[PDB]
């Protein structure tokens, strides 16, 4: 007895489609993502090498696992024999462990970038980022070795239980306690920084009003030396070409504060007040460019990673414990929900990241 046996051939030709059309959309979405990076030298970044390295594993799953997941899922048996299904399992288990852990190494980059901006930009390289893809492809294999030691029924060793729980801890719970701890850190920095920056513009605006309606030099001085402190901070908030243009606009803002200050120090209050009038002009113009998506979008990867892989890994632990009102259709349905992760990852990075959306539309 296998449940599939009582599902007629009308539904079986509609269930060759969806799993042929899900398999295909994984190959040509993750290949459109590698060739986007392969085909751009501004996109040749240490953090866009990882996205490709990710899409690389999700491309392996789409050709090694997904088309030969279906001849088993549709019928309910296994035609291809012993020497085959030992390295069919090995791929599925590791290639989906790679897929998961690559989401950690991506979130290690974001974390160390947004937390140690200055110092880790030197360690951040291709070579240091090649170590990461590698040591996650090596550790991934080190999970599928344990069952290798120990007809028509392809499945993995559920006799040793210590393996069962180690396999689900080393490739899932660690990676989601880690994801939750990094996204925690990141969201709190990323939210403090806009607050810090909001306090900077609040100072620069509050103090301008002080100068406008000021009766003497002394208070114009203290007010201009506060905008300066504040401008010179905003300038450090967020290599060489793009950013250059952003900082230059502050180097005007600052120079106007400097020229005012001089007149304030020379005792020329009315002169300073005029000199400061130019500042509103400059504030007014860098109000558009003040008025956080990189951090919003990793909330969709966490979300679409939780929703995809949690069920399979929960249901993977109470099965060997507990049919406790359990149908092998629900263990098969949440196996495709975790394969679906290898689809959803590329399609979030086109709506999210603005360099894959300049690519696709062409």
């Amino acid at each position, epitope marked *: 007895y296998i449940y599939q046996d009582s599902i007629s051939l009308p539904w079986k030709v509609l269930l060759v489609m969806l799993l042929a059309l899900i398999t295909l959309a994984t190959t040509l979405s993750n290949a459109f993502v590698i060739a986007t990076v392969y085909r751009t030298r501004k996109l040749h970044t240490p953090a866009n090498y990882l996205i490709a390295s990710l899409a690389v594993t999700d491309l392996l799953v789409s050709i090694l696992v997904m088309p030969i997941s279906t001849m088993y899922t549709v019928t309910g048996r296994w035609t291809l024999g012993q020497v085959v299904c030992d390295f069919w399992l090995s791929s599925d288990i590791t290639c989906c462990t790679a897929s998961i852990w690559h989401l950690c190494v991506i979130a290690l980059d974001r974390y160390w970038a947004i937390t140690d901006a200055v110092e880790y930009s030197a360690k951040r390289t291709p070579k240091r980022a090649a170590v990461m893809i590698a040591l996650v492809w090596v550790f991934s294999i080190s999970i599928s070795l344990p069952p290798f030691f120990w007809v028509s029924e392809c499945v993995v060793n559920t006799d040793h239980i210590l393996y069962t729980v180690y396999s689900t801890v080393g490739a899932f719970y660690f990676p989601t306690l880690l994801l939750i701890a990094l996204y925690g850190r990141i969201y709190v920095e990323a939210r403090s920084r806009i607050a810090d920056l909001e306090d900077n513009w609040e100072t620069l605006n509050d103090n301008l009003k002080v100068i406008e309606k000021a009766d003497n030099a002394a208070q114009v001085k203290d007010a201009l030396t506060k905008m300066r402190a504040a401008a010179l901070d905003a300038q450090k908030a967020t290599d060489s070409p793009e950013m250059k243009d952003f900082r230059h606009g502050f180097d005007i803002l600052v120079g106007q504060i400097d020229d005012a200050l001089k007149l304030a120090n020379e005792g020329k209050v009315k002169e300073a007040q005029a000199a400061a*009038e130019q500042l509103k002009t400059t504030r007014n113009a860098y109000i558009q460019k003040y008025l956080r998506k990189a951090t919003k979008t990793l909330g969709i990867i966490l979300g679409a990673f939780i929703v995809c892989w949690l069920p399979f890994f929960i249901i993977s632990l109470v099965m060997p414990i507990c049919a406790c009102w359990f149908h092998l259709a629900i263990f098969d349905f949440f196996t495709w929900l975790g394969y679906l992760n290898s689809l959803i990852n590329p399609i979030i990075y086109t709506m999210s990241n603005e360099d894959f959306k300049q690519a696709f539309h062409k």
Partner: antibody
Amino acid sequence: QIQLQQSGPELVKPGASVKISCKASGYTFTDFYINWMKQRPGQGLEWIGWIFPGSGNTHYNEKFKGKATLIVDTSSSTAFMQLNSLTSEDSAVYFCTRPVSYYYDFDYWGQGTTLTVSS
Amino acid sequence: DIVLTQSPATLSVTPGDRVSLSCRASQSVSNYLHWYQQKSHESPRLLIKYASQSISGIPSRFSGSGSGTDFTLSINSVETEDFGMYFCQQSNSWPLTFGAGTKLELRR
């Protein structure tokens, strides 16, 4: 008698550059922003940029970025604008002006200088 | 850049007549708007600064009104000396931008 006395008109070959003058009098030249303006016969004016004489700091209109360079010679209390790699679209009238402040009863313009770009 | 649309392009008035010159900013420029006369190439004469402030020495028949995007220079009774180009400039944000002119022509 506050006054801005700009230099005379200039025939100039396309490809060449020019320096235009704005000698300022009857107010401490170093205490006030200066703006430079372009106007062609049938049209509105456009702003090129300002300099602050006391420091020589400058902002420019993206439009005129590589074209105009504003400098200043404090010692003769004058301002210069150097336009470079000139074209037919450069023949026009050039005004320097002390801008209009909330705090001062008037503003102040040069008489204009007229560039002619031809072979 | 902020676009100052002046209307209308050209305007014919009989001396005596009341005249409202309109200047419309593509976005808000608050009260940072000034008005100029230009008879010809000669350097512009500032009529009105900061929208409503009137300039020492400019005659009383000239006055300004407005804020945000809609601005009006106003000659309550146009004289014969009043032909020329009326120009609104904004100083809200960089770059400074002018209008293309209302060309005021007198009847006789």
